[PDB]
Symmetry: C2
Subunit: 118 residues, 2 copies
């Protein structure tokens, strides 16, 4: 009934899509969402519209879109809301555009681990 | 003796610099590093070279540079190692330690779930 769509920037190197794929597999492992799809803004496939369509066609009517980005900017405030036509979705279907990662204490934790090469 | 330099992409909007600044202040609060500076790759100030020089001139000789980026890509593997002159302004008697980005860390999964639920 609802789907998680994880959305990422995309890269000409493979690292970005690998990351979204690992994140989606990890979230799949927690069994919270019936459907979990990934989309990339530029360069790679699947694209954000493709991810959304895949979710709809598995029978979701509430699409939770989470931008896997550190901060807001052009991509999160313009391009993505655009691609989601929030500015090809049925009536019976709502897109719920969520919030990026931001300055979360857990990323402070992650940064200190990285500082120490852990 | 060692300094943490947090390095971020930079943006034409202000959100990116705000985030690095909040991150640096939060790290400052944990009292682990004598010196903590931030640098932005494009658009904003301070710049990566500026952040590094500020760290050196406060008397650090090992600079820990952490790229606050989700994944590797052009910025983390080319531009930044370049700006740090780790590839191809830094004196001797000082080493840059270029660390690893955030990657697919379990804590990011936790954060994504929170975001999914509008927390």
């Amino acid at each position: 009934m609802e789907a998680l769509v994880l959305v990422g920037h995309g890269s000409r190197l493979p690292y970005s899509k690998e990351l979204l794929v690992k994140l989606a597999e990890k979230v799949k492992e927690r069994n919270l969402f019936p459907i979990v799809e990934i989309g990339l803004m530029e360069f790679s496939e699947p694209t954000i519209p493709q991810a959304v369509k895949k979710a709809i066609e598995q029978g979701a009517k509430r699409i939770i879109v989470v931008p896997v980005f550190l901060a807001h900017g052009i991509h999160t405030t313009r391009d993505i809301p655009r691609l989601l036509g929030l500015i090809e979705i049925p009536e019976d279907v709502e897109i719920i555009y969520r919030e990026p990662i931001g300055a979360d204490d857990r990323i402070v934790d992650i940064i200190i681990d990285r500082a120490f090469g852990r």
